[PDB]
């Protein structure tokens, strides 16, 4: 019976994809979490000493400079200190920036979606948290992460060559993707006819002439964002490999 045999293969494949999605989501959760905690650790150290000499020395520590492209403190009065050095664009105010507002609105450590960096005019992600001292908010510490770095973490596993992983918001906005052309596009723009639904377990759709299976796994431990790890699998390839 071809129907029972088809369902037998599909259930085995979905079981495997569920397993790959869980571990990859765990992996990016732990990776982002360490970056978040490093930013949190930096803020609480600054909360008890934020003199210019100390701010500079702390941001230059190699645990920070080797982890983030840049680490910085934007203060409540608008003053901005960033390491490593970078030329500054005219009219910059850290308080108007997405990372600063997101941290303040979150009331704690959070991650931005990709936004246009003020200096490089390129997309960047930022781990950010307020600096709190006796209820006062003195500012926000941010740590910048390249989207390429996140693509590499979620694609550490090759998924037996069946496909690839990307990140998507609960709103359907593609945040990081191996194809740079799909970054910040929505699932509806990428799949206009039969759009995959995040809530549904496994969706089938057509991309570039081939049927693909999509599966979305929530990423836990990310305060104030609802992001999913998405697997995009070549359907014909997966069914053939699993006989
Ligand atoms: C001064 S630009 C670099 C800091 C941060 N990524 C921003 O765009 O605001």
Which residue among 64, 78, 99, 101 is best mutated to probe the pocket of ligand 1, counting the most ligand atoms within 8 A of its Cβ? 99
Containing H/E element for 2? helix 2-47
Cα(225) to ligand 1 centroid in Å equals 20
User: In Å, how far from its chain's centre is CA 146?
Assistant: 9
Report how far residue 71's alpha carbon sits from residue 92's, in angstroms, rounded to the nearest whole number. 16
Technique used: X-ray
What values do phi and psi take at 144, rounded to 5?
-85, 140
Angle, CA 190 vertex, CA 149 and CA 220 arms, to 5°: 45
Which residue among 71, 98, 124, 141 is best mutated to probe the pocket of ligand 1, counting the most ligand atoms within 8 A of its Cβ? 124
Distances (CA, A) of 122 to 94, 117, 125, 147: 17, 5, 10, 10
Cα(145) to ligand 1 centroid in Å equals 11
Residue of 64, 144, 68, 58 whose CA lies nearest to 100: 144
Buried b (16+ CB within 10 A) or exposed e, 8-35: eebeebeebbeebbeebbebbbebbbeb
- Residue list, ligand 1 pocket, CB within 6 Å: 70, 72, 92, 97, 117-119, 124, 126, 144
Cα(57) to ligand 1 centroid in Å equals 19
Which residues are CB-contacts of 240 (< 8 A; sequence separation ≥ 6)?
Answer: none
Q: Helices 2-47 and 147-154: crossing angle, nearest 10°? A: 140
Cβ 126 vs Cβ 110: under 8 Å: no
Containing H/E element for 154? helix 147-154
Cα(77) to ligand 1 centroid in Å equals 17
Q: How many other β-carbons are positioned within 10 Å of the β-carbon of residue 96? A: 12
């Amino acid at each position: 019976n071809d129907y029972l045999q088809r369902n037998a293969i599909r259930e085995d494949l979905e079981s495997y994809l569920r397993e790959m999605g869980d571990v990859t989501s765990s992996n990016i959760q732990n990776w982002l979490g360490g970056r978040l905690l490093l930013v949190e650790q930096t803020a609480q150290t600054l909360a008890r000493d934020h003199s210019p000499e100390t701010v500079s020395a702390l941001l230059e520590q190699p645990a920070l400079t080797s982890t983030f492209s840049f680490t910085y403190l934007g203060q409540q009065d608008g003053v901005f200190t960033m390491r490593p050095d970078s030329p500054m664009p005219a009219g910059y105010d850290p308080r108007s920036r997405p990372w600063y507002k997101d941290a303040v609105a979150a009331g704690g450590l959070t991650l931005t979606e990709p936004y246009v960096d003020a200096a490089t005019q390129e997309l960047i992600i930022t781990a950010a948290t307020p600096v709190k001292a006796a209820g006062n908010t003195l500012g926000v510490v941010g740590g910048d992460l390249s989207l390429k770095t996140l693509v590499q973490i979620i694609n550490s596993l090759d998924f037996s060559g069946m496909g690839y992983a990307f990140l998507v918001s609960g709103d359907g906005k593609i945040l990081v993707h191996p194809d740079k052309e799909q970054v910040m596009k929505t699932l509806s723009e990428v799949y206009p006819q039969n759009t995959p639904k995040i809530a549904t377990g496994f969706s089938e759709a057509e991309l570039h002439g081939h049927t693909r299976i999509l599966a979305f796994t929530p990423i836990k431990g990310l305060p104030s964002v609802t992001w999913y790890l998405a697997l995009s699998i070549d359907k014909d390839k997966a069914y053939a490999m699993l006989s």
